[PDB]
From a paper:
Lyme borreliae produce other outer surface proteins, including CspZ (also known as BbCRASP-228,29). CspZ promotes bacterial dissemination to distal tissues by evading the complement system, the first-line innate immune defense in vertebrates in the blood, through binding and recruiting a host complement inhibitor, factor H (FH). Additionally, CspZ is only produced after Lyme borreliae invade vertebrate hosts and, as such, induces CspZ-specific immune responses after natural infection. Similar to CspZ, CspZ-YA is an all-α-helical protein composed of nine α-helices (denoted as helices A to I).
Numbering used by the authors: 19 to 235
The structure:
């Protein structure tokens, strides 16, 4: 008759991912807070060696010490491992290699550390969206699948504006939907309000399709 058995399998798969990934944004925030000074010091004091070399060495030490930062990224990778097997792995290797090679003094290497980090930060955000993209694409409900495409696009446009703020919104919003908490569609922001609201509008549309499925189960 109907496809309730299938729709329930889809809700189940989405709910598992979201609950398993619920600390993803907090974990990226902890990387950002530890590394932001070190990133900016590399960008500043490597733009021209004149020199602050001691500052650059110390900045590199924050990214390298006890492989802590690399392992924090691997912890995020392990969260999305089931879903996007090779998304992040190359970019984590690239960073690891730059860190391995940065035995100073070498600004280019120091700038390569900073760029490989920034690129990896943005990938960790896209990885979450890509996982939801793969999950949503297994939905038998065509209205949900259409609403999911619109969400991923607005999600990605939001990432371009600010990767950590975008990831925080995506995680909280998807979280609200699978826990049946009504999504607020308004941004109260002073920075990035336009793109946040575009993203929140696509999430209200998705919440609509999600509820329409849920109400038949």
């Amino acid at each position: 008759g109907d496809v309730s058995r299938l729709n329930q399998r889809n809700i189940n798969e989405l709910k598992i991912f979201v609950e398993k990934a619920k600390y993803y944004s907090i974990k990226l925030d902890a990387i950002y807070n530890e590394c932001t000074g070190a990133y900016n010091d590399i960008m500043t004091y490597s733009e021209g060696t004149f020199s602050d070399q001691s500052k650059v060495n110390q900045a590199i030490s924050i990214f390298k010490k006890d492989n802590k930062i690399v392992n924090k990224f691997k912890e995020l990778e392990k969260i999305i491992e089931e879903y996007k097997p090779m998304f992040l792995s190359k970019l984590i290797d690239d960073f690891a290699i730059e860190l391995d090679q940065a035995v100073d003094n070498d600004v280019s290497n120091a700038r390569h550390v900073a760029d490989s980090y920034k690129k990896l930060r943005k990938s960790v955000v896209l990885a979450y969206i890509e996982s939801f993209d793969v999950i949503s694409s297994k939905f038998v409900d065509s209205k949900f699948v259409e609403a999911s495409k619109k969400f991923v696009n607005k999600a990605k446009e939001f990432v371009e504006e600010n990767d950590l703020i975008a990831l925080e919104s995506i995680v909280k919003t998807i979280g609200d939907m699978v826990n049946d908490r009504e999504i607020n569609s308004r941004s109260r922001a002073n920075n990035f309000a336009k793109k946040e609201a575009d993203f929140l509008g696509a999430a209200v549309e998705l919440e609509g399709a999600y509820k329409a499925i849920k109400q038949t189960l």
